[PDB]
């Protein structure tokens, strides 16, 4: 679900880097490392929390497209249809 996919992804990111959910919500059109101070381990933690709550598989070449919030939303969409 759009609302659900969306708020759970922003929940995961607001957990890992802990900025108020709206404040990360808006800044999706930037880069996680150039403007969001996101590490290899922050990205890995988001991906693991996604595989956990979402009971979803992830091949991590997808991680190269893990650069913005809306980007991970799109890849998460693709995987929740992946089955």
């Amino acid at each position: 679900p759009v609302e659900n996919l969306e708020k759970e992804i922003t929940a995961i990111v607001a957990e890992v880097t802990e900025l108020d959910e709206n404040e990360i919500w808006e800044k999706r059109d930037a880069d996680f490392f150039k403007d969001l101070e996101i590490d290899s381990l922050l990205a890995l933690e988001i991906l693991a929390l996604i595989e956990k709550k979402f009971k979803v598989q992830i091949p991590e070449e997808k991680l190269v497209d893990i650069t913005s919030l809306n980007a991970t939303i799109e890849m998460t969409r693709s995987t929740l249809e992946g089955k």
Binding site: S40, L41, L44, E45, A48, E60
Partner: protein, 135 residues
């Protein structure tokens, strides 16, 4: 398996080596190692001088050293840096205790690995730890 294979396989040398023997090794799934602890260690006299109790930080270190020897047996030929640790310390560990460290793989990626580790004295879990390593 032999403590002399652990020499080159694991670069950690004398003062910071926390593994003695390899009990099992099921490649890419699970390893279990023996670290035998004795009162003749420097951290015991350094940690809480009167009563000897080995610090949990070194139990986590031994778990990580088991994870690395697990990693090196198939992915060989790349430093495996420890990236994260979520650890719970259950029960103290004293001289004379054999610390058995069971490392299980949960995920392996090109440049990252995730591990579940349990440290026991007997079949009594005294430490649990979810570990993560980068490359």
């Amino acid at each position: 398996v032999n403590f002399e294979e652990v020499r080159e396989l694991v670069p950690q040398k004398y003062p910071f080596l926390f593994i003695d023997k390899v009990i099992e090794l099921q490649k890419e799934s699970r390893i279990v190692c023996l670290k035998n602890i004795s009162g003749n260690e420097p951290f015991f006299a350094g940690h809480f001088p009167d009563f000897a109790i080995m610090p949990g930080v070194l139990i986590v270190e031994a778990l990580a050293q088991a994870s690395i020897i697990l990693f090196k047996k198939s992915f060989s030929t790349k430093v495996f840096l420890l990236a994260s640790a979520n650890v719970r310390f259950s029960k103290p560990v004293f001289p004379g205790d054999q610390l058995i460290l069971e490392i299980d793989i949960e995920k392996v990626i090109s440049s990252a690995a995730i591990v579940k580790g349990v440290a026991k004295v007997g079949d009594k879990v005294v430490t649990k730890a979810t570990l993560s390593f980068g490359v």
